[PDB]
Design a protein around this ligand. Sequence first.
Ligand SMILES: NC(=O)C1=CN([C@@H]2O[C@H](COP(=O)(O)OP(=O)(O)OC[C@H]3O[C@@H](n4cnc5c(N)ncnc54)[C@H](OP(=O)(O)O)[C@@H]3O)[C@@H](O)[C@H]2O)C=CC1
Ligand SMILES: Cc1ccc2[nH]cc(CCCOc3c(C(=O)O)cnn3-c3ccccc3)c2c1
Ligand SMILES: [Co+2]
Length: 159
Amino acid sequence: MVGLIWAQATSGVIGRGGDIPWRLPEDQAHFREITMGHTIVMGRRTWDSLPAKVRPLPGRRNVVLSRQADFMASGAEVVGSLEEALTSPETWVIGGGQVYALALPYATRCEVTEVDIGLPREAGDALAPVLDETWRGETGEWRFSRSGLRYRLYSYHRS
Ligand SMILES: NC(=O)C1=CN([C@@H]2O[C@H](COP(=O)(O)OP(=O)(O)OC[C@H]3O[C@@H](n4cnc5c(N)ncnc54)[C@H](OP(=O)(O)O)[C@@H]3O)[C@@H](O)[C@H]2O)C=CC1
Ligand SMILES: Cc1ccc2[nH]cc(CCCOc3c(C(=O)O)cnn3-c3ccccc3)c2c1
Ligand SMILES: [Co+2]
């Protein structure tokens, strides 16, 4: 199984300037819960976005997708292709915008956190993948983050 997990503003932005313009501590815990014990596949720019203190993310097989044959990610696996990374029972693609789109054909689950931040789309932003007709969503309650933004969980499944 391959899943995608991302947080987006209502507009669809997931990243800007190489990072995320919000931090919901409740979303950080949900990500650990859903990913713990499994393979996380991330692009090179998102691995760069991980603080060196926290990477690799513990309890998980960190796989970094890159076109650089010399790029090294200490404590992670660097592979040049996405399915070179899909050899475990359950795989989660943890970003970013480029790898979400590259992994969407392989994906049957999208765990999406919608952050009620009014953030207009702008050039150079990373955007969430477009989910087509095949995706069925189940929606959760609007909840309050301690960071002051509303959020809610969207679970997308497809056969
Ligand atoms: N809101 C959220 O939940 C999340 C937000 N983000 C944000 O997303 C942004 C980064 O996303 P983005 O800019 O799209 O970059 P990515 O994280 O998707 O990494 C892209 C890189 O991966 C390599 N790559 C891309 N396609 C391929 C391919 N077919 N084969 C092999 N390698 C490939 C390349 O690395 P190389 O150039 O070295 O060859 C490319 O530069 C950041 O702001 C991040 O914080 C990240 C995770 C989730
Ligand atoms: C890369 C990525 C992609 C999509 C995502 N959606 C939700 C998150 C929250 C991620 C928290 O990731 C973690 C861990 C952990 O997962 O164990 C330990 N520390 N950090 C951590 C990381 C960066 C800053 C500060 C703390 C996310 C992350
Ligand atoms: Co699990």
